[PDB]
């Protein structure tokens, strides 16, 4: 029978919490790990978060296994220039609960952006990850550490050579337009017969 010890690590414990990028567990692979670059100039927050999470969790790999948590390191750039459609930065609420009574914190996207722009991207990545992995703390925490958020354009990850990941949004669609009218080109044999 498997047994998890009650004497686990804690945030107040002096040993502290580990980094899954530095850990050496069995279900953590590091060989097939590629570095992608994702520019967030203009791309919307939920769309860019979904695109980033699909490469973070390793879902784009054909050999993806739910147990083995493997993925690619995505470096998101220009998060300060991320764009959401109008009135959303003011209307979209972000709420959480603290241990104190009546501690229902409710902040706007504008407030979280003026506090730290990376917090918004991290929150949306957490949501997109918990959409599929919420049961295991491992499966819901280990992927997030593979995202390298950066407010401005500069970043120290120049040695890993991140490839400029290209992605197409599911919104592109051509509504039917009026058939343009143009002159017909005839033929001598057609005019003959």
């Amino acid at each position: 029978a498997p047994f998890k010890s009650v004497l686990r690590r804690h945030k107040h414990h002096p040993e502290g919490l580990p980094l899954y990028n530095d850990m050496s567990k069995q279900w953590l692979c590091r060989e097939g790990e590629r570095w992608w670059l994702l520019d967030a100039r203009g791309e919307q927050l939920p769309r860019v978060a979904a695109v980033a999470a699909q490469y973070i969790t390793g879902q784009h790999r054909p050999d993806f296994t739910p147990g083995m948590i493997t993925g690619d390191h995505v470096v998101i750039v220009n998060i300060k220039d991320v764009v959401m459609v109008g009135d959303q930065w003011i209307r979209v609420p972000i709420t959480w609960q603290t241990a104190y009574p009546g501690g229902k914190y409710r902040i706007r996207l504008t407030d979280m952006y003026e506090r730290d722009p990376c917090m918004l991207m991290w929150w949306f990545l957490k949501d997109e990850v918990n959409r599929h992995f919420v049961r295991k703390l491992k499966t819901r925490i280990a992927p997030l550490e593979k995202a390298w958020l950066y407010e401005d354009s500069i970043h120290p990850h120049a040695d890993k050579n991140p490839r400029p990941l290209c992605w197409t949004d599911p919104e592109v669609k051509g509504w039917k337009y009026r058939d343009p009218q143009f002159i017909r080109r005839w033929k001598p044999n057609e005019f003959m017969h």
Binding site: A1, F3, Q59, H60, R61, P62, D63, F64, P66
Partner: protein, 175 residues
């Protein structure tokens, strides 16, 4: 009431603590475990398994430039009839073959025609006898049968068809 006691007694070693020490607690735990595992296997396991294999195939197709939706529709159109399990096996162990399948689905190659309905030969309308010979439709059916015989694999019967059809003439003894 038939409580599975004598059968589930032998699995108590898999449990731990009081369920392994005492008997009835472990028996209740094993009964509940087996019941819920059977329920999950019957009504909920296949959904998750097929979702996993579908996601893997969709990722393999997206790495080439398509999606599960278009890939599945065009496979059904081209009448390839490859289960998602086989699609995943190809995507994981035969990337060249899976890429070739994707290229076939993407290309404008004419899919096979629908199966032709079995028709009746023209000789079935001939008066027989017209006034010890075989029926013309029966002879044509035998010829097509021998052709299909020789078409399947190599055999010592030969590629010619007239000599193989005229085997009763060989077996016949000259009177």
């Amino acid at each position: 009431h038939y409580r599975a006691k004598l059968e589930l007694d032998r699995i108590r070693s898999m449990l731990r603590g009081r369920a392994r020490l005492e008997r009835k607690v472990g028996l209740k735990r094993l009964f509940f475990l087996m019941r819920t595992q059977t329920r999950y296997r019957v009504e909920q396991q296949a959904h998750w398994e097929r979702a996993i294999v579908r996601k893997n195939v969709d990722s393999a197709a997206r790495e080439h430039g398509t999606g599960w939706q278009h890939l599945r529709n065009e496979l059904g159109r081209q009448n390839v009839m490859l289960l998602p399990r086989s699609q995943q096996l190809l995507a994981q162990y035969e990337p060249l073959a899976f890429r070739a399948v994707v290229e076939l689905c993407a290309s404008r190659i004419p899919p096979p025609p629908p199966p032709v309905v079995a028709s009746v030969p023209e000789e079935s309308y001939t008066l027989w006898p017209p006034a010890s010979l075989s029926h013309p439709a029966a002879r044509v059916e035998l010829r097509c049968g021998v052709e299909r015989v020789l078409r399947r694999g190599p055999s010592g019967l030969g590629n010619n068809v007239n000599e193989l059809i005229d085997a009763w003439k060989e077996f016949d003894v000259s009177p």
